[PDB]
Design a protein around this ligand. Structure first.
Ligand SMILES: CCCCCCCCCCCCCCCCCC(=O)OC[C@H](COP(=O)([O-])OCC(O)COP(=O)([O-])OC[C@@H](COC(=O)CCCCCCCCCCCCCCCCC)OC(=O)CCCCCCCCCCCCCCCCC)OC(=O)CCCCCCCCCCCCCCCCC
Ligand SMILES: CCCCCCCCCCCCCCCCCC(=O)OC[C@H](COP(=O)([O-])OCC(O)COP(=O)([O-])OC[C@@H](COC(=O)CCCCCCCCCCCCCCCCC)OC(=O)CCCCCCCCCCCCCCCCC)OC(=O)CCCCCCCCCCCCCCCCC
Ligand SMILES: CCCCCCCCCCCCCCCC(=O)OC[C@H](COP(=O)([O-])OCC[N+](C)(C)C)OC(=O)CCCCCCCCCCCCCCC
Ligand SMILES: CCCCCCCCCCCCCCCC(=O)OC[C@H](COP(=O)([O-])OCC[N+](C)(C)C)OC(=O)CCCCCCCCCCCCCCC
Ligand SMILES: CCCCCCCCCCCCCCCC(=O)OC[C@H](COP(=O)(O)OCCN)OC(=O)CCCCCCCCCCCCCCC
Ligand SMILES: CCCCCCCCCCCCCCCC(=O)OC[C@H](COP(=O)(O)OCCN)OC(=O)CCCCCCCCCCCCCCC
Ligand SMILES: CCCCCCCCCCCCCCCC(=O)OC[C@H](COP(=O)(O)OCCN)OC(=O)CCCCCCCCCCCCCCC
Ligand SMILES: CCCCCCCCCCCCCCCC(=O)OC[C@H](COP(=O)(O)OCCN)OC(=O)CCCCCCCCCCCCCCC
Ligand code: HEC
Ligand code: HEM
Ligand code: HEM
Lengths: 247, 93, 62, 75, 385, 57
């Protein structure tokens, strides 16, 4: 297919977790949660991330308890059998904005916004794709395209026409640590947060990988030595042939 | 148990090779040897001998197939671009 | 050539042939391999058993 | 007070030596496509030229330039 | 006699792994079999410890896999170990087969060993296809539909065998629960066939890279080849720990993190990377019935190899044209695998057709003609007349 | 005294595998602590306790 149908490839930005000894910037995850809650939570879901997984990664225990209690989940029905509701706890999951898929497609002009809880693993490019898609919206589509109405141009989306309009604008969120919250800074923060939501094992996985790679490299070289020590007597074997006398 | 068919490998004592005579073999204890002996010499000279004998068989077909893949990939990226649309519309239609 | 005349083994023979030195060297190397492989084996059997133990949500409703 | 760093870097690398040439090829295509559009009977041509390829070349150079030096500017 | 010989079970263990007389000449390519044994044990153990948490319904399959990833302790280790260990199992199995048809191991004392190997290969392909179908992503679902709708090309009973495979009318809950029960089951059939592989090997013993008899000096397998296999075991675990811990979703496709949706096609349906050459073989034929017949023929053409090898010396160690055309075959297989991952665009259909023809002409045309030519060159280079 | 080193550590296999296991125990402990402290000092200002001290200061 053509380059427009493929989509433009995202370049290789220098993320703070690129590299085998690195770690998510956890302040970037906290700021990215704020940008998700204030902008992305209107249309996209986070169906796989429990509230308890944020405790000790980006927020404190009470800081997560209050954000969970500001929502309302389905309780077990009362003693007369009527349905009940409940303030959220740490066991519950982060609720989406829509009750079903038809409400989503009705609210967003036929297209359904994907759940973002695995979206940097579900897309070729990963963090570079999410960042470059969010900041890739030009001010005008290139001269020649026929964009369908209700759709927007973004060259990193395959085909070009995406049903998400440009959502990130300068200083639409104020961070609580006083960071200048521009478009690029907010896209960096949400992409770090979505990468944490996809791979919440990332730090421990890289740390354990350091341990196994060190132990297994040492074992490999040490086993090369023990193989050469065992096979010394066969590698240094000498054969002499005196031809036997005819009989 | 029952005896099974004639194979081509026996066991320790009746392997089934020819009769051997007049071959003496000598070998020293590895506890009295140096392992890792000659590794820095074999690493550069023996590896170069092995490479020099066994690389045309590997890198002439690799070169043929890599040039084929590169040329076909270039033709595809040409035909699905703006400059090469006329030949695309005559090569498929 | 006779068979009582054994060939040239001097390029690979070590020149000081103390028994305890070479035996302790070889057993130190195989002991280090046994040590690291024992730690690795303990860690993988604990990885599987701790996989079996309990779960984040089962511990969340605790 | 603070302006977006990515459009800052994109305009800075659009004001370079060959970036002006890429922009110039894009504007050549853009004026060619629009005086194709103002021709009488334009919606019947069965194959209408766009400038997506030239936009891709310009955006690819801007991607390679702005990529390794943006995250130094971001916090 | 010794207790390791005078037992029932220790006699088998002794005869196979302790006092087994190996030819002393065998190089590092003779460790792929013990490597495949290690890989099989890895797959079985990690799969059992993930099946303790997997739920197999169509509405619970994908989310149970993410429950393994996010909620089970060290469950990402288990899932990444199972997936990358399956792919490593296939790379090592391709090396085992390529060694076998380089060094002439298929030949006349060992044809039943080669054929039990081909049966093992077919069973591992089936096992991995079912296990990729159990995760129920987007490539998983649509891979299941195109591979099962292959069988609708049989002109009499095709629709009923595909409706018997599906358990219904397309890939849904009966198909996924079936594929889980079978993806458990076929590995234990593979373990039985591996025991039969070892039994067919043990009667004549292994070959050697010279191709001459190895009956003259031999080495017991314990304390020599145990440690020579330990070297490659630690190397394989090192490279697998690299791919599991630092690069885990590299060999996989990203579209298996989209849940399976029967209404949206993912615009390039490709299987896992090791089934790409057979996928390109299937894709090259402009018919579906001939396509599946040619794919099954492409894997059943390994049986015509002990009858088309027309030469008197075993292996390609001392032949130049056999070496050259062997590596033409290997890079043809790699090009076929890369063609299978591309779209059906204009140079690729011709490249896949020519590479499929080269794949079939290797076994049926190239090996007999080159074998006969090398035979008469070996004769007239050294006899005088 | 290489003879004394051999006679205490490598002569009996009971003592040999005993010190193999003792060394594996202490190696596992201090290897774990060393890798965690290196990993945390390499990732300084990025872990959670640094951000917690920052929002507590
Ligand atoms: C160098 C490469 C080379 O040229 O080698 C050829 C050279 C001789 O070549 P040759 O005899 O012509 O080759 C014959 C056969 O090819 C091989 O004959 P062989 O079976 O006698 O040799 C075994 C073979 C075993 O290797 C294999 O067969 C594997 C196949 C090759 C894989 C190559 C890629 C490996 C990638 C690894 C990383 C990923 O050894 C190697 O090939 C070594 C390759 C290792 C490469 C990296 C070395 C880094 C050194 C630091 O062999 C060696 O140099 C051996 C050197 C290994 C010394 C190991 C000593 C270890 C000492 C103890 C370590 C302790 C660690 C810390 C302990 C901490 C305690 C708590
Ligand atoms: C690094 C590239 C190696 C190039 C330099 C090596 C010397 C050379 O030119 O050898 C040509 C040599 C031809 O030598 P030959 O004596 O005519 O071959 C007899 C046998 O093929 C080979 O008989 P063997 O017993 O020597 O087989 C050992 C061989 C092959 O060993 C294996 O095949 C083991 C295969 C992998 C086992 C672990 C599997 C892990 C599973 C995932 C695999 C993912 C891929 O591994 C080695 O060659 C070790 C020596 C490496 C010396 C390194 C010198 C570097 C410059 C200083 O071809 C190879 O050695 C291929 C191995 C290269 C693999 C390393 C990558
Ligand atoms: C690049 C070309 C450099 C060539 C290096 C080379 O060929 O080394 C030759 C010797 C090898 O020494 P060796 O492999 O131990 O052989 C022992 C036999 N001797 C020499 C005692 C009779 O040289 C050596 O001993 C090299 C040892 C030092 C190398 C350190 C790592 C670099
Ligand atoms: C699970 C992995 C556990 C690894 C434990 C490895 C280990 O502890 O090795 C120790 C013995 C070494 O056995 P060896 O090398 O024959 O030494 C015999 C005793 N000497 C000669 C010193 C007197 O090794 C053994 O006794 C056999 C261990 C078999 C596993
Ligand atoms: C039908 C179509 C043609 C098919 C046959 C093509 C086979 C090509 C094989 C070439 C080859 O076999 O070259 C292998 C040889 C092996 O060198 P050696 O160690 O035997 O040297 C022995 C010398 N006394 O490398 C070389 O001579 C060196 C090449 C150097 C190139 C510069
Ligand atoms: C029959 C079973 C066969 C399974 C074989 C699995 C090995 C295949 C190689 C895969 C990568 C290495 C293992 C990753 C799992 C792991 O646990 O690696 C993590 C450990 C350290 O982790 P930790 O102690 O910090 O805690 C773990 C989580 N609490 O690193 C190692 O020591 C790697 C050393 C492996 C040595 C294998 C020896 C064979 C033992 C068989 C019993
Ligand atoms: C611990 C103490 C045990 C008893 C004391 C003792 O070890 O007894 C020593 C006995 C005695 O043997 P002998 O020959 O002296 O008998 C003389 C009788 N007159 O040897 C043995 O057991 C044999 C040991 C063989 C080891 C084989 C290892 C097999 C490894 C693979 C296992 C299966 C894997 C399958 C997958
Ligand atoms: C599917 C079919 C496959 C068929 C082939 C399978 C063969 C097995 C290949 C896998 C290697 C197993 C190594 C066992 C080594 C052994 O147990 O060694 C036993 C040796 C016998 O020493 P010795 O008698 O030489 O002592 C001479 C003087 N007494 O004790 C040792 O030195 C212990 C050394 C430490 C070994 C640690 C090994 C850890 C293995 C981890 C990976 C396991 C998988
Ligand atoms: C309101 C309606 C919003 C807001 C505020 C955001 N998104 Fe986005 N999104 C939305 C729709 C309707 C779609 C579907 C468009 C389509 O054609 O598929 C999307 C799409 C995405 C994607 C996927 C793009 C792809 O498939 O390649 C990602 C990733 C995505 N949206 C992320 C995202 C982020 C990180 C936001 C942060 C504030 C965000 N969206 C806002 C609808 C809406
Ligand atoms: C012959 C050895 C085996 C092979 C080649 C194999 C292959 C595979 C493959 C390729 C996958 C898909 C991995 C992914 O993409 O996520 C998979 C998944 C799976 N396999 Fe296996 N498998 C083997 C043995 C087993 C066994 C014996 C079991 C059961 C005990 C098992 C259980 C599973 C399960 C539960 C999944 C679910 C999806 C996942 O967790 O990744 N496997 N298998
Ligand atoms: C689960 C997969 C397999 C296992 C465990 C396995 C196991 C083994 C083992 C242990 C050996 C002896 C060591 C060696 O020669 O490398 C061996 C030899 C052999 N295997 Fe396999 N094998 C498997 C798959 C296959 C396949 C797919 C084929 C080919 C179709 C095959 C054909 C052979 C041949 C021909 C030999 C003899 C090679 C020789 O020694 O000359 N095997 N197998």
């Amino acid at each position: 297919m053509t380059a427009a149908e493929h989509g433009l490839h995202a370049p290789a930005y220098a993320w703070s977790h690129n590299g085998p000894f690195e770690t998510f910037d956890h302040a970037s995850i906290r700021r990215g949660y704020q940008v998700y809650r204030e902008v992305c939570a209107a249309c996209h879901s986070l169906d796989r991330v429990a509230w308890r997984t944020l405790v000790g990664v980006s927020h404190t225990n009470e800081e997560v308890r209050n954000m969970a209690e500001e929502f309302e989940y389905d309780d077990e029905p009362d003693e007369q059998g009527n349905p009940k509701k409940r303030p959220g706890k740490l066991s519950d999951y982060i609720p989406g904005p829509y009750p079903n898929e038809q409400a989503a497609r009705a609210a967003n002009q036929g297209a359904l916004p994907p759940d973002l809880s695995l979206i940097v693993k579900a897309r070729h490019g990963g963090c570079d794709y999410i960042f470059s898609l969010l900041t890739g919206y030009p001010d005008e589509p290139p001269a020649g395209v026929a964009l369908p109405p209700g759709s927007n141009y973004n060259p990193y989306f395959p085909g070009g026409s995406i049903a998400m309009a440009r959502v990130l604008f300068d200083d639409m969120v104020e961070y609580e640590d006083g960071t200048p919250a521009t478009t690029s800074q907010m896209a960096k923060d949400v992409t770090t947060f979505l990468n944490w939501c996809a791979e919440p094992e990332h730090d421990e996985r890289k740390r354990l990988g350091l341990k196994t790679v060190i132990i297994l490299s040492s074992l490999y070289l040490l086993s090369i030595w023990v193989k050469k020590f065992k096979w010394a007597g066969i590698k240094t074997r000498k054969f002499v042939f005196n031809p036997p006398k005819p009989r | 148990g029952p005896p099974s068919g004639k194979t081509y490998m026996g066991w320790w004592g009746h392997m089934g090779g020819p009769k051997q005579k007049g071959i003496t073999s000598y070998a020293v204890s590895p506890y009295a040897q140096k392992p890792l002996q000659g590794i820095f010499h074999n690493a550069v000279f023996n590896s170069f001998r092995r490479f020099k004998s066994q690389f045309l068989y590997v890198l002439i077909p690799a070169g043929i197939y890599w040039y084929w893949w590169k040329n076909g990939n270039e033709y595809n990226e040409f035909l699905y671009s703006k400059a090469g649309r006329e030949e695309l519309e005559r090569v498929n239609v | 050539k006779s068979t009582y005349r054994t060939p040239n083994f001097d390029d690979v023979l070590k020149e000081n042939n103390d028994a305890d030195k070479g035996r302790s060297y070889a057993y130190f190397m195989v002991g280090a391999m046994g040590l690291l492989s024992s730690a690795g084996a303990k860690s993988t059997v604990e990885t599987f058993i701790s996989s079996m133990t309990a779960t984040a949500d089962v511990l969340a409703m605790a | 007070e603070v302006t977006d760093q990515l459009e800052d870097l994109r305009e800075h690398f659009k004001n370079t030596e060959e970036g002006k040439a890429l922009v110039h090829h894009y504007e050549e295509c853009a004026e060619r496509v629009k005086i194709q559009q103002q021709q009488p009977g334009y919606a019947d041509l069965e194959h209408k030229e766009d400038c997506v390829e030239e936009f891709f070349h310009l955006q690819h150079y801007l991607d390679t330039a702005t990529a390794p030096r943006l995250f130094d500017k971001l916090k | 006699m010794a207790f390791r010989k005078s037992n029932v079970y220790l006699s088998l263990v002794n005869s196979y792994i302790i006092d087994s007389p190996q030819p002393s000449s065998i190089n590092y390519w003779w460790n792929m079999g013990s490597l495949l044994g290690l890989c099989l044990v890895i797959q079985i153990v990690t799969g059992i410890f993930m099946a303790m948490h997997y739920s197999s319904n169509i509405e619970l399959a994908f989310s149970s896999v993410e429950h393994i990833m996010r909620d089970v302790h060290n469950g990402y280790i288990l899932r990444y170990l199972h997936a990358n260990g399956a792919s490593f199992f296939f790379m090592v199995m391709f090396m085992h087969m390529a060694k076998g048809l380089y060094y002439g191991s298929y030949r006349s004392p060992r044809v039943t060993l080669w054929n039990v190997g081909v049966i093992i290969f077919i069973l591992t392909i089936a096992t991995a296809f079912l296990g990729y179908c159990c995760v129920y992503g987007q490539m998983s679902h649509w891979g299941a539909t195109v591979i099962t709708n292959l069988f609708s090309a049989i002109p009499f009973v095709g629709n009923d065998i595909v409706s018997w495979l599906w358990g219904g009318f397309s890939v849904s809950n009966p198909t996924i629960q079936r594929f889980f029960a079978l993806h458990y089951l076929v590995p234990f059939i593979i373990a039985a066939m591996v025991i039969m592989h070892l039994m067919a090997l043990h009667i004549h013993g292994s070959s050697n890279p010279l191709g001459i008899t190895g009956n003259l000096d031999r080495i017991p397998m314990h304390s020599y080849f145990i440690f020579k296999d330990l070297v490659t075991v630690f190397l394989f675990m090192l490279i697998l720990a690299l791919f599991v811990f630092y690069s885990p979703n590299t060999l996989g496709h990203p579209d298996n993190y989209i849940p399976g949706n029967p209404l949206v096609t993912p615009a390039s349906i490709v299987p896992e990377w090791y089934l790409l050459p057979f996928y390109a073989i299937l894709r090259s034929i402009p018919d579906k019935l001939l396509g599946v017949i040619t794919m099954f023929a492409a894997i059943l053409v390994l049986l015509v190899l002990p009858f088309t090898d027309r030469s008197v010396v075993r292996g390609n160690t001392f032949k130049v044209l056999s070496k050259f055309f062997f590596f033409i075959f290997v890079f043809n297989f790699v090009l076929l695998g890369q063609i299978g991952a591309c779209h059906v665009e204009v140079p690729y259909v011709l490249m896949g057709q020519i590479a499929t023809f080269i794949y079939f002409a290797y076994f049926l045309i190239i090996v007999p003609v080159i074998s006969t030519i090398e035979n008469v060159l070996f004769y007239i280079g050294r006899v005088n007349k | 005294s290489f003879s004394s080193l051999y006679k205490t550590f490598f002569k009996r296999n009971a003592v040999f595998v005993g010190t193999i296991f003792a060394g594996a125990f202490v190696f596992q402990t201090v290897f774990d602590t060393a890798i965690t402290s290196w990993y945390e000092n390499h990732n300084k200002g990025k872990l959670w306790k640094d951000v917690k001290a920052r929002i507590a200061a």
